[PDB]
Design a protein around this ligand. Structure first.
Ligand code: POV
Ligand code: POV
Ligand code: POV
Ligand code: POV
Ligand code: POV
Ligand code: A1CE1
Ligand code: GLU
Lengths: 43, 241, 414, 99, 98, 51, 49
């Protein structure tokens, strides 16, 4: 028979690990701009 | 729109919890070393209320560290409040309570229809068991039914939709089939299928005949074997059921 | 047929109906191995007095000693075909009539002959329904405990480097306290925290954080109301159509009353062969026990007469009948084959159907509706569902009570 | 010792319905020498070997039609489709990032 | 002007409008308005994604057992190929007379 | 007002209104921001409906 | 849901000297995987979602 919807989703890390990649990418990207804007100031 | 929460739950968040939290924010800020205009109890109540309704309303935030921590706790509560309130806001707000204009055969609209609002227009197909029962039981209602006598189920079925007739009184088994087999699922039977003068069908065998005992047992055999349930599904099922 | 003990005098206690008319009670002589004079009243008794008055006969009502409705048990240990219950008493001359919910069955119709039904009904399934339990931490459920930590931990990691990316950027800055309030007020959507991050780098990180906090909150609040109340999806059973009931599984227990019409219906049916074997293990001696068994979650389903099961759902609201009706055979007044009263009994039943007497009998005894019925309305979050979040705000005041002293003592220290 | 049992199932009900339509009687009996069928040393055993040695007329059961058997016994039309399938336990689902 | 930006900024949940009401009476009305503007938005956004796609369910047929297939109707037309096996399957069947 | 504040103000409106943006001055710009706020209301409704 | 599960067979007259050799080669080609190869090249394409 058709499978019923599996409710009560606890929403572990693996469900939301993609979001933390976005935050981690911004964390690294912002650091690069931090290094980039220091080179701009120096030169 | 007030249905997503119970009344006593409504009270605590916005009479007990909100007042105590507003006092707590005011008390914490009053004793805070770092605590523009001074924070007052009205600003605390205005700030707590605004957090409940998203954060669109302008507010005045406290300056103490612990006062902001309490506001943060209230902000988490305001996050939960909106989540639970708005989860079924649309579902609660489309609920329709369809109220019937009549209750049953003993309704005053049926027994004494003249001394009322514009008279009820109800009738039935004559020369049947339904009219006989109304003849014996409701003498006054039957006389009023004579003017609205129909010619058949199909003729009376369309008179309900047009508006010439209001209530059609007939066999439950036939009316259930007509209600089930319908276009638009608009024709319903009052009482959610309520049946008055509960009788049944039956093969009208000759009086004092030896076949009655065998026919009765044969019919009861179909009930036990489940053949009657299959017959009802084949013939007495509609899209409105 | 209600049975109640009589008073000390030996007479039925006087009770009145809601309308105000006295309730007619008949002194029975049923068992407790000991036969004592009890008190009987109800739908069948109220019909019995009407039958007696019109047909001009007296009566001596006595309960069945066996306690069973009636089934054919041709036990081969004695090689004798015997009926057990009210059917056995009627055929043995002990009783001349059976004024009780006797289902019109083919097996019984061969030996005894019924009357016109006085109650048209069928078989349905009674269950325990689903009580939505609530905990104090239901609001902490939509997230696993592990990413609850990472959500909190990432607030401080972002806040620390928001301040670091502002203190050391070439360029009113963002202090550590103001960075914590930014990365917290964004997450909780509170107004506190008014210092937007300076610098190109912190603005990038302080805007992706806002998007992160939006997804985190949205996924948290996407199904919060479901976690607060909780519920078993759909219903336990939906009639005899689902594979959960077609075959036994040792986790769902469904049974009926022993030696009744439901036993014969399932025994004779060819498709319902595994159902009968599963029911044969847990079949109950009386319907009242099976109703009580469902109450304390030891019986999962009860297949009984729809006339009686629907009455229980009205009185005790923790039970809700489920499934469509089947084996639609009504209750007839049993009698022996000769039965000089057969013709007049059916006519009085037919006439009292059209007279409205049965409809009046249904209203006085069957139609009560003590509790609320069922509908498609969504559940309203009550006191117990929201009790977890009330202790969150209350604990946010108690914590601040001990927090304010630390803040005062901190300034003195510094 | 030809002890007697009770036989029922999907194929038996087909056999009953066939028997009424074609008007023939039968006496089923379970196998003892193997099952289904296998040509060991050039001799068929099992359910397919008892039709080869004229011990019975038909072999109602879970017999699959194949070229090897159909060259020694006549097969009726397939009353149910079967074949070869692989049964394994379900794998661990992985939620794709960027969902 | 500052009163219009308060009403609009509350309704649209934008920061436009920083002037809160000063008097007690305007503060009562200016906070019930926030609740009104929260129910109105919530009921608007409760099913907005459904209106964007605008998908009509109950169109797929569950099979030959669909009640709409059981009875004829001018709105629903179903047919097969003439003189084929499907024609003689439905012709020979007893239940599928309609 | 510059252009970084305009982009910061528009982005913050998309993610509810949590961040401390700087508002413009003048009816026309505040009307445009209000129009973007209506869009940000629709964006969140559509995005979070099936998140 | 599928109903009237009757498959496609080669039609032939009653005499049909090729009666059994046709069915045997159909059965053999089933077990050889020939029909599975025929399905892949002709029936199993799967252009879109
Ligand atoms: C959608 C789901 C929920 C639906 C329902 C809930 C949504 C609707 C709810 C709306 C409620 C809105 C409340 C706004 C608070 C304003 C406070 C204020 O102006 O304070 C003033 C004073 O006030 C006080 O000191 C007393 C504070 C209590 C006022 C409560 C009024 C309630 C009126 C009935 C509300 C019910 C109406 C709704 C029904 C008709 C001014 O402050 P201040 O002078 O800075 O401070 C004083 C200090 N000092 C004296 C030292 C100077
Ligand atoms: C949208 C977001 C905005 C806000 C974001 C804010 C982020 C802030 C983040 C904060 C991090 C908090 C982490 C804990 C979260 C609670 C869940 C938990 O552990 O429950 C547990 C259930 O356990 C129970 O059922 C009993 C206890 C429940 C409450 C747990 C106490 C938490 C203590 C600390 C509180 C810290 C508070 C701060 C003070 C330092 C589940 O885990 P378990 O124990 O393995 O379960 C056993 C399984 N069993 C139950 C079936 C047997
Ligand atoms: C400050 C005041 C409190 C603030 C609360 C804030 C959150 C408010 C949310 C409350 C929701 C309820 C959560 C728990 C529910 C499951 C557990 C349960 O039922 O039993 C518990 C009840 O709970 C408590 O006694 C309080 C639990 C507080 C949780 C947060 C503590 C954070 C500490 C973080 C420290 C991190 C490390 C810090 C250093 C780095 C305890 O059980 P018991 O005591 O055996 O008695 C049972 C009670 N009974 C008999 C009545 C049934
Ligand atoms: C069942 C459970 C339910 C829970 C529901 C919770 C719901 C949400 C509830 C509450 C959330 C809001 C309160 C928490 C944050 C307080 C701190 C802050 O904002 O600013 C601090 C920054 O402090 C610093 O500079 C040091 C950095 C660490 C502080 C935070 C530690 C963790 C707090 C716990 C976090 C949770 C645990 C996380 C675990 C991973 C204050 O700074 P200060 O120096 O004191 O300022 C004075 C100095 N000055 C005058 C010079 C400026
Ligand atoms: C699921 C949710 C949606 C999907 C996820 C979305 C997540 C959110 C993603 C991204 C949000 C990023 C917000 C950036 C904030 C802009 C303001 C700013 O930086 O201020 C600076 C503006 O800088 C400038 O002067 C140039 C402006 C051009 C655009 C710069 C930002 C592009 C970074 C793109 C990197 C993308 C990283 C994305 C990584 C994932 C400085 O301000 P100022 O000094 O006042 O400026 C004066 C102006 N003047 C120079 C003309 C005089
Ligand atoms: C302490 C003051 C500053 C204000 O918070 C004070 C705000 C307060 C007056 C409001 C707030 C919420 C209101 C309830 C909302 C819903 C319902 C359900 C409905 O079925 C009956 C009415 C009831 C219980 C409302 C009662 C008033 C109520 C508690
Ligand atoms: N049904 C098969 C045996 C089971 C299998 O497929 O291995 C046969 O009749 O030979």
């Amino acid at each position: 028979n058709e499978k019923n919807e599996v409710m009560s989703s606890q929403l572990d890390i693996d469900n939301m690990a993609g979001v933390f990649y976005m935050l981690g990418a911004a964390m690294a990207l912002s650091l690069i701009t931090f290094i980039s804007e220091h080179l701009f100031y120096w030169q | 729109f007030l249905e997503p929460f119970s009344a006593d739950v409504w009270v605590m968040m916005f009479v007990m919890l909100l007042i105590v939290s507003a006092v707590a924010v005011f008390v914490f800020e009053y004793f805070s070393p770092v605590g523009g205009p001074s924070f007052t109890i009205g600003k605390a109540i205005w700030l707590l209320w605004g957090l409940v309704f998203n954060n669109s309303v302008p507010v005045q935030n406290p300056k103490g560290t612990t006062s902001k921590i309490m506001v943060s706790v209230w902000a988490f509560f305001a996050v939960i409040f909106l989540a639970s309130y708005t989860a079924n806001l649309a579902a609660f707000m489309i609920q329709e309570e369809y109220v019937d204009q009549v209750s049953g055969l003993s309704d005053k609209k049926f027994q004494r229809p003249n001394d009322f609002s514009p008279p009820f227009r109800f009738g039935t197909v004559p020369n049947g068991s339904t009219e006989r029962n109304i003849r014996n039981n409701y003498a006054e209602m039957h006389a009023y039914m004579g003017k609205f006598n129909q010619r058949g189920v199909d003729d009376a079925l369309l008179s309900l939709k047009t508006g010439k007739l209001d209530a059609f009184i007939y066999d439950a088994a036939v009316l259930n089939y007509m209600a089930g087999r319908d276009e638009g699922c608009k024709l319903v039977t009052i009482g959610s299928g309520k049946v008055f003068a509960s009788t049944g069908y039956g093969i009208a065998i000759q009086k004092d005949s030896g076949w009655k005992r065998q026919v009765d047992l044969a019919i009861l055999q179909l009930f036990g074997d489940g053949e009657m349930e299959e017959l009802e599904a084949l013939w007495l099922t509609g899209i409105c059921h | 047929v209600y049975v109640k003990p009589t008073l000390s005098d030996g007479t039925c206690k006087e009770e009145f109906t809601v309308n105000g008319d006295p309730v007619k009670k008949v002194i029975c002589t049923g068992p407790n191995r000991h036969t004592v004079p009890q008190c009987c009243y109800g739908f069948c008794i109220d019909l019995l007095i009407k039958l007696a008055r019109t047909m001009n006969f007296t009566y001596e009502v006595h309960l069945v000693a066996d306690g069973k409705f009636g089934t054919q048990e041709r036990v081969n240990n004695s090689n004798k075909k015997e009926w057990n219950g009210m059917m056995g008493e009627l055929l043995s001359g002990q009783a001349d009539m059976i004024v009780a919910p006797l289902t019109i069955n083919n097996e019984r119709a061969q030996y005894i002959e019924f009357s016109k039904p006085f109650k048209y009904q069928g078989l349905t399934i009674l269950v325990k329904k689903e009580i939505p339990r609530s905990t104090l931490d239901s609001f902490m459920q939509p997230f696993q405990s592990t990413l609850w930590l990472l959500v909190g931990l990432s607030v401080h990691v972002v806040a620390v480097m928001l301040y670091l990316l502002d203190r050391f950027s070439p360029f009113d800055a963002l202090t550590l306290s103001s960075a914590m309030w930014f990365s917290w007020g964004v997450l909780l959507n509170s107004g506190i925290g008014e210092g937007a991050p300076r610098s190109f780098s912190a603005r990038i990180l302080g805007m992706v954080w806002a998007g992160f906090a939006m997804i985190i909150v949205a996924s948290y609040t996407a199904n919060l109301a479901a976690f607060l109340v909780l519920d078993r999806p759909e219903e336990r059973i939906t009639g005899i159509n689902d594979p959960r009931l077609r075959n036994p599984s040792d986790k769902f227990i469904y049974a009926t009353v022993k030696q009744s019409s439901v036993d014969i219906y399932f025994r004779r049916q060819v498709e319902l062969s595994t159902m009968y074997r599963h029911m044969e293990k847990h079949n109950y001696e009386s319907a009242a026990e099976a109703i009580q068994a469902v109450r304390d979650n030891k019986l999962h389903a009860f297949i009984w007469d729809s006339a009686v099961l629907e009455f229980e759902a009205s009185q005790k609201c923790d039970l809700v009948t489920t499934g469509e009706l089947f084996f639609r055979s009504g209750f007839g007044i049993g009698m022996r084959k000769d039965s000089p009263w057969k013709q007049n009994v059916s006519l009085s039943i037919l006439k009292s159907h059209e007279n409205g007497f049965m409809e009046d009998l249904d209203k006085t005894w069957v139609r009560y509706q003590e509790c609320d019925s069922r509908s498609n309305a969504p559940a309203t979050l009550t006191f117990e569902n929201m009790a977890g979040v009330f202790m969150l705000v209350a604990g946010g005041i108690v914590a601040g009570i001990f927090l304010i002293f630390i803040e005062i003592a901190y300034k003195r220290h510094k | 010792g030809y002890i007697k049992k009770c036989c029922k199932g999907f194929c038996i009900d087909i056999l009953k319905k066939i028997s009424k339509s074609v008007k023939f009687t039968y006496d089923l009996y379970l196998v003892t020498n193997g099952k289904h069928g296998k040509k060991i040393n050039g001799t068929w055993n099992g359910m397919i070997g008892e039709v080869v040695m004229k011990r019975a007329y038909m072999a109602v059961g879970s017999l699959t039609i194949n070229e090897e058997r159909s060259e020694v016994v006549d097969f009726s039309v397939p009353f149910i489709e079967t074949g070869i399938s692989v049964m394994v336990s379900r794998s661990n689902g992985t939620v794709s990032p960027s969902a």
